[PDB]
């Protein structure tokens, strides 16, 4: 999961390496964020021509949670760390066409119909 | 005042009884009763109904005129009845009628159903035209106003329910 000033990993070829949370959206005066929640993150380290430069402010979504998330059948699928993929307010389609690691089955939302195609590993 | 000085002719088949301040009128449609204000005196006045303001009331003339108008309306109702016609202007505005409830659909996600007071008959010669027959003008007017309030005449196309 996410908290104030959380450290997030990167699961796309956008060039981001270290992304740090700044604000939490999806509810006024909200505390934390979930896997199926929109979070506000910025970048700390970028490749020579990374899509994100230091101090950037743009949305993102967590695909993997270190704390773990639940399922209706009691499954508590959890990962070694927090992985987040950047999103934009306009042109939601993320630049990265490749996602590292598996993804859960909760990405069946209206806007997440184009991400389930990616991530061949489940 | 001026309207009060006008006895109203009661046609045949209408029975009028003055029990003190109460006026009871009977006719073909059915019974009707109405408690009259004490500020005006009404006598039988066979074939008519004379109204006289009571001494000591400043509002006597207007009260007598209103009572005369109401008695005339009641007489005209009982003798023949009152009819009102309402049109529904607009596409998809239905006026289905069943039992003692009028169902209307004027663009709302739910039907609007209005109960019919006893003694009021609703008919639909055309699906978009609704006719109400009643012995009392007040009841028919109130039901018509309730139907009209569901969809106000739209002041860009003149849609809704209109008289």
């Amino acid at each position: 999961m996410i908290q104030e000033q959380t450290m997030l990993n990167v699961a796309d070829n956008s060039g981001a390496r270290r992304v740090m949370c700044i604000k939490v959206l999806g509810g006024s005066h909200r505390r934390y964020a979930g896997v199926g929640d929109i979070i506000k993150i910025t970048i700390k380290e970028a490749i020579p021509r990374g899509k994100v430069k230091k101090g950037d402010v743009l949305k993102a979504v967590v695909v993997r949670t270190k704390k773990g998330v639940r399922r209706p059948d009691g499954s508590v699928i959890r990962f070694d760390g927090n992985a987040c993929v950047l999103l934009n307010n306009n042109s939601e389609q993320p630049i990265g066409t490749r996602i590292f690691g598996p993804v859960t089955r909760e990405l069946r939302s209206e806007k997440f119909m184009k991400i389930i195609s990616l991530a061949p590993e489940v | 005042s001026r309207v009060a000085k006008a006895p109203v002719v009661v046609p045949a088949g209408v029975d009028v009884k003055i029990n003190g301040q109460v006026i009871t009128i009977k006719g073909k449609n059915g019974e009707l009763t109405r408690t009259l204000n004490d500020a005006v005196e009404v006598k039988h006045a066979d074939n008519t109904l004379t109204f006289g303001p009571r001494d000591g009331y400043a509002d006597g003339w207007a009260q007598a005129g209103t009572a005369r108008a109401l008695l005339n309306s009641m007489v005209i109702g009982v003798t023949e009845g009152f009819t009102k016609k309402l049109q529904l202007v607009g596409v998809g505005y239905r006026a289905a009628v069943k039992g003692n409830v009028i169902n209307l659909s004027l663009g709302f996600s739910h039907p609007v159903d209005h109960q019919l007071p006893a003694g009021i008959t609703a008919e639909c010669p055309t699906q978009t035209e609704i006719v109400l027959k009643g012995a009392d003008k007040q009841v028919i007017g109130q039901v018509a106003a309730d139907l009209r309030a569901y969809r106000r005449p739209e002041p860009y196309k003149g849609k809704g329910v209109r008289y």
Binding site: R71, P72, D73, G74 | -
Partner: protein
């Protein structure tokens, strides 16, 4: 249809065939015997006073023994009221099963929460106070499973009280 008094036993998750296991609290509802009927003529309002369970001979006071004898019911460990639905009254000595809740799908659970020790000023007023052991009614609870031949009720979520605590289940009047 009408409120029944039962005893909390435990809570678990009932695994559904579609992997949607739901938290279910388990209530044992023995056949509650209607001890008395409170009517408008005598008691001033419509209701039934009911009991359930068994009482030890020493535990039954002679006034209570006479009350049960008049009621023609076995001495139950507790007595409770249940307001009728202005439909009809019950007869003295009538045992009510759990079939009434078999076709409700929405019930409210009233009970006393687990007691908690000394609640200091910070815990109470943020003088001191206490929390727990208070009769509160959690509403809008849908019954999951009903077993009349076993007197077993499974209700969604959680209910006040620990194992063996007495509680009441009533029709979900509030929605």
């Amino acid at each position: 249809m009408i409120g029944l008094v039962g005893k909390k036993v435990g809570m678990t998750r009932i695994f559904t065939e579609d992997g949607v296991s739901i938290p279910v609290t388990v209530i044992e509802v023995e056949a509650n015997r209607v001890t008395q009927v409170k009517d408008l003529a005598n008691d001033g309002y419509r209701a039934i006073q009911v009991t359930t369970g068994a009482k030890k001979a020493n535990r039954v006071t002679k006034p209570e023994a006479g009350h049960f004898a008049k009621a023609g019911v076995e001495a139950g460990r507790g007595l409770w009221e249940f307001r009728l639905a202005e439909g009809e009254e019950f007869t003295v000595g009538q045992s009510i099963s759990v079939e009434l809740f078999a076709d409700v799908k929405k019930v409210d659970v009233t009970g006393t929460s687990k007691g908690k020790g000394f609640a200091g000023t910070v815990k109470r007023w943020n003088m001191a106070g206490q929390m727990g052991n208070e009769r509160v009614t959690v509403q809008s609870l849908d019954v999951v499973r009903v077993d009349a031949e076993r007197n077993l009720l499974l209700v969604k979520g959680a209910v006040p009280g620990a194992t063996g605590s007495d509680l009441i289940v009533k029709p979900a009047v509030k929605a």
